[PDB]
Amino acid sequence: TWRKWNVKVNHNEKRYATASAIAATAVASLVLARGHRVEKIPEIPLVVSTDL
Amino acid sequence: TVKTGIAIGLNKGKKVTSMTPAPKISYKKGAASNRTKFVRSLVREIAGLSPYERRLIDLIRNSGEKRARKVAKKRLGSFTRAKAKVEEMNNIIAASRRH
């Protein structure tokens, strides 16, 4: 049971990857390559009203 | 008593307005009371002397203070208790010899 299960990551490197992941959501080619059906979407990033 | 304000020396430490708190009661343990002095003095004449105390009384009269303290330190455990034992064997000898 004392095998290492959880892995420590530097907080700034966790944040580094999160910022990269957010910026990758704005690239429609990456979103299309990831398997999403955004072929007929108006624009990326897709922003909707706060009423949602 | 007062600190010098510097980090080394005789009275090193920060200068602070002192307060001298009230003395506690626990800091009074051992202090003799009127009742307890009466009981310990009464028991001494009821019970009498120990065999080693009789020896110390004889050695004080015969061999002197130094030999009595050496035997008292052997019978007790310390040089400090040997002094207090020889001191109040001197008191018993002083009271017995007088009058």
């Binding site: 959880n6 892995v7 | 028991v43 009498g48 120990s50 080693y52």
Partner: protein, 203 residues
């Protein structure tokens, strides 16, 4: 009161008055059973300051235990091992003769709980003890909250677990640097110091 005079008189153990009393009393205890009930404490001052109350539910027993070292109970003195464990004679039991006295009384009187015990006499062969016991089933003990704590199941056989005064002394239960091995129990301290503490995010 008279209990203060009894306390100061009991301290001068080598006076003529107590040399006679201890000589007569040590004879009486040899001629009685090794464990026997005492009708009253021969040291009522010492019993009081250990928590004895002169009321129904408090029992005094008297007990004598063989003095000396604990000879290793190996056949013919032969130990099977290294020379460091070949000692047989000069080996000492880790509990006081007072503690052995408390358990033997406690086993004889398993319906009671041992509160405390005190030395009364000794000769070359035995040390003599008087053990204060409290009845947890007696109604005079079950009410009167100053002593009904001992009616709890957690206090069954305190003398066997070393929870009495001599039991805690022999366990080493005292504060400070002199008792670092034994403050909360040395086996718990040893377990804690010999435990590998591994966190999910390894330090």
């Amino acid at each position: 009161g008279a209990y203060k005079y009894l306390e100061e008189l009991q301290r001068k153990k080598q006076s003529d008055v107590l040399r006679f009393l201890q000589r007569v009393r040590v004879w009486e205890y040899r001629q009685k059973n090794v464990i026997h009930r005492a009708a009253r404490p021969t040291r009522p001052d010492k019993a009081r300051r250990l928590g004895y109350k002169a009321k129904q539910g408090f029992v005094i027993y008297r007990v004598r235990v063989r003095r000396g070292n604990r000879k290793r109970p190996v056949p013919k003195g032969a130990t099977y091992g290294k020379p460091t464990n070949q000692g047989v004679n000069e080996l000492k039991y880790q509990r006081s003769l007072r503690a052995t006295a408390e358990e033997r009384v406690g086993r004889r009187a398993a319906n009671l709980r041992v509160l405390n015990s005190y030395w009364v006499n000794q000769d070359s062969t035995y040390k003599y003890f008087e053990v204060i016991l409290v009845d947890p089933q007696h109604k005079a003990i079950r009410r009167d909250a100053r002593y009904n704590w001992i009616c709890d199941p957690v206090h069954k056989h305190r003398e066997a677990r070393g929870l009495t005064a001599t039991g805690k002394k022999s366990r080493g239960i005292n504060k400070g640097h002199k008792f670092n091995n034994t403050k909360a129990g040395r086996r718990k301290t040893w377990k804690r110091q010999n435990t590998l503490s591994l966190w999910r995010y390894r330090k």
